Design a binder for this molecule. Structure first.
Ligand SMILES: Nc1ncnc2c1ncn2[C@@H]1O[C@H](COP(=O)(O)OP(=O)(O)O)[C@@H](O)[C@H]1O
Ligand SMILES: Nc1ncnc2c1ncn2[C@@H]1O[C@H](COP(=O)(O)OP(=O)(O)O)[C@@H](O)[C@H]1O
Lengths: 99, 61, 120, 122, 122, 122
């Protein structure tokens, strides 16, 4: 358990890769699209950050429209996340300051 | 140990309160509203609950 | 051991026993008179595990499951691994300006398999 | 492992949805869906997790102790009026009322739904 | 004070002193009641409050005048910052703004705050 | 980020070493180095961390509060005698009257080094 807690989602690296990806695509990307392009190694741990992205920059997120994303973890078990619909955009995200 | 602590105070130019606060800083976990942090973490006791007993006994005499 | 022999490391076993006893007390309190299962089976605990290790936290989650208590765990983006392993939904709450708001999310294990084209 | 998880609903009632309206910092209408297998409320400090739990606790307990987790079992930090008015912080020391978001005539609605073998109680 | 001026061979003075010492003993017997602590504890006769202001605009922007009214993370942030300031002041020799004993030890300092606010404390 | 890192150790004394000998559960001679840019003491719960903090606090204070991390609010369970004797009260399973690691004649030494611009104080 010490070792598992040793390695965890370093959200600064995730933020950097995410904002670089948004700048490269420069288009409104949904959560499932981001997961497909960016393979999360911690599942929901990453997703929350992305959500923390969308609502930090004012990008409204809709829960009525539910998108999905199928992801396989380290041991191989596959899970279907029922993510909401978001409108992540690079300009607004790079606008807002990151701690 | 009293002389050793006095030597430390002289070397680091800080009173005993500084090191007592340093020790109390390791028990910061059990914290609450600013009132309790101030009355239990910094500004050590210096209460007068014991002198009151002596005054009471003298007044009994 | 008539008396708890020892812990799992700095109150490990002691913490486990205390959590189990309190869970049993909650189950009995919520279990109606002459009832084996509590009619009100949902439990809310803010700051799920701030002072508890992963090894113990899994134990308390298992204990809550055993006594038929459906619990919602509140955490500040901490201890995500065990929550994700032992839950199936997450209400991301975020506050901007002077207003807060929520956003639900959920996941489920596809029946598929542990792994295909390999050892089974 | 998933076979045991089906016990929920089959045995007794479990919460499944929380409805909030003008509660604390939750302006407007907000809805939270609770999975029958257990749910997690996550988000950075300065959020609605404590507020959301406080609404539900107000729904159940006759005399709720708000912000119990932060207060550590001491005197309740807040009250029903504070949550209803949506007070955000002490609010400076020159009046202003900027901390309060619902100073005038306003209404708040809090709802919670529990399921048990299909039967629903709100 | 009024009785000290009476010419009665220290009778009124004795009575007033008796009342005062009775108050002192009453406080001493209940050595943890709020009243007793306020009476006989230097750090209990005055309250404590924090205020966040603007670097250039001197008006208080958010004054927690005790006003608990805060999530676990916010209280942890305030307490950690205040303790850090107190330690810095204590270890700094009089008339110097750089402490000479620059090591401080924290033990499970952060448990109620998110990873984003902990970095600010560091 | 790194530029500020060099400030520490210039105008102040920073801890840069700890040595223990038969202290608590640290039988024999152990040495631990500390970085000038902050350091973290990590490991499975109940291995030695609070023992290190208590050794340093003993080196520093007159009446150190041992295990202030967990016992804060009430009297500390540990004391200097236990650390010198190396009792293992918590750790049990076959406890032969507290597992006094060193019951007979014994010696325990604890040393802390602080450095500033090449000047050492142990
Ligand atoms: N009665 C109140 N007075 C002041 N602020 C309040 C009150 N109720 C809610 N809040 C605000 O809403 C938030 C509630 O705390 P919260 O974020 O949910 O807990 P946590 O620290 O675990 O994340 C805080 O930011 C707080 O400032
Ligand atoms: N003086 C002592 N008295 C009791 N137990 C001790 C003592 N010194 C070491 N131990 C044992 O060694 C371990 C010390 O755990 P420790 O790391 O210091 O606490 P923490 O979890 O806060 O980090 C415990 O299992 C404890 O039982």
């Amino acid at each position: 358990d010490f070792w598992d807690a040793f390695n965890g989602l370093d959200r600064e690296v995730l933020i950097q890769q995410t904002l670089q990806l948004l700048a490269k695509e420069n288009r409104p990307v949904g959560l499932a699209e981001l997961a497909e392009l960016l393979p999360p190694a911690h599942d929901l741990e990453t997703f929350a950050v992305w959500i923390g992205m969308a609502r930090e920059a004012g990008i409204e997120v809709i829960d009525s429209q539910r998108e999905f994303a199928e992801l396989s973890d380290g041991e191989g078990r596959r899970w279907r996340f029922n993510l909401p619909t978001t409108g992540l955009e690079s300009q607004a995200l790079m606008d807002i300051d990151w701690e | 140990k009293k002389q050793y602590l006095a030597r430390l105070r002289d070397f680091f130019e800080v009173g005993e309160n500084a090191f007592t606060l340093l020790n109390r800083a390791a028990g910061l976990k059990q914290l609450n509203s600013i009132d309790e942090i101030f009355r239990e973490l910094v500004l050590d006791d210096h209460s007068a609950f014991d002198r009151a007993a002596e005054v009471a006994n003298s007044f009994d005499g | 051991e008539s008396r708890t022999g020892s812990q799992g490391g700095s109150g490990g076993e002691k913490e486990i026993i205390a959590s189990y006893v309190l869970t049993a007390s909650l189950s009995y309190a919520l279990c109606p008179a002459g009832s084996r299962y509590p009619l009100f089976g949902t439990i809310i605990l803010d700051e799920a595990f701030s002072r508890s290790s992963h090894a113990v936290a899994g134990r308390i989650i298992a204990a809550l499951r055993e006594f038929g208590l459906h619990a919602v765990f509140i955490t500040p983006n901490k201890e995500m691994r065990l929550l994700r392993d032992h839950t199936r939904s997450a209400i991301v709450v975020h506050r901007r300006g002077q207003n807060s708001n929520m956003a639900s999310l959920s996941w489920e294990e596809l029946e598929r398999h542990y792994q295909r084209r390999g050892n089974a | 492992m998933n076979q045991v998880s089906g016990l929920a609903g089959k045995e007794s009632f479990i919460l499944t949805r929380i409805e909030l309206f003008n509660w604390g910092g939750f302006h407007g209408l907000h809805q939270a869906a609770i999975h029958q297998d257990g749910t997690a409320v996550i988000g950075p400090t300065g959020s609605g997790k404590t507020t959301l739990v406080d609404a539900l606790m107000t729904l159940l307990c006759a005399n709720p102790r708000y912000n119990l987790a932060s207060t550590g079992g001491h005197e309740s930090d807040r009250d029903l009026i504070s949550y209803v008015r949506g007070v955000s912080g002490p609010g400076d020391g020159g009046e202003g009322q900027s901390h309060i978001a619902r100073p005038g005539k306003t209404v708040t609605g809090i709802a919670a739904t529990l399921e048990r073998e299909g039967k629903q109680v709100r | 004070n009024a009785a000290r001026f009476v010419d009665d061979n220290g009778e009124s003075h004795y009575k007033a002193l008796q009342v005062l010492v009775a108050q002192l003993r009453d406080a001493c017997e209940r050595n943890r009641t709020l009243g007793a602590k306020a009476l006989l504890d230097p750090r209990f006769r005055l309250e404590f409050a924090v205020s966040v202001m603007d670097r250039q605009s001197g008006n208080v922007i958010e004054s927690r005048t005790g006003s608990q009214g805060g999530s676990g993370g916010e209280k942890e942030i305030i307490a950690s910052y205040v303790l850090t300031a107190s330690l810095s002041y204590a270890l700094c020799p009089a008339g110097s703004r750089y402490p000479l004993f620059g090591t401080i030890i924290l033990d499970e300092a952060f448990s109620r705050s998110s990873h984003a606010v902990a970095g600010r404390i560091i």
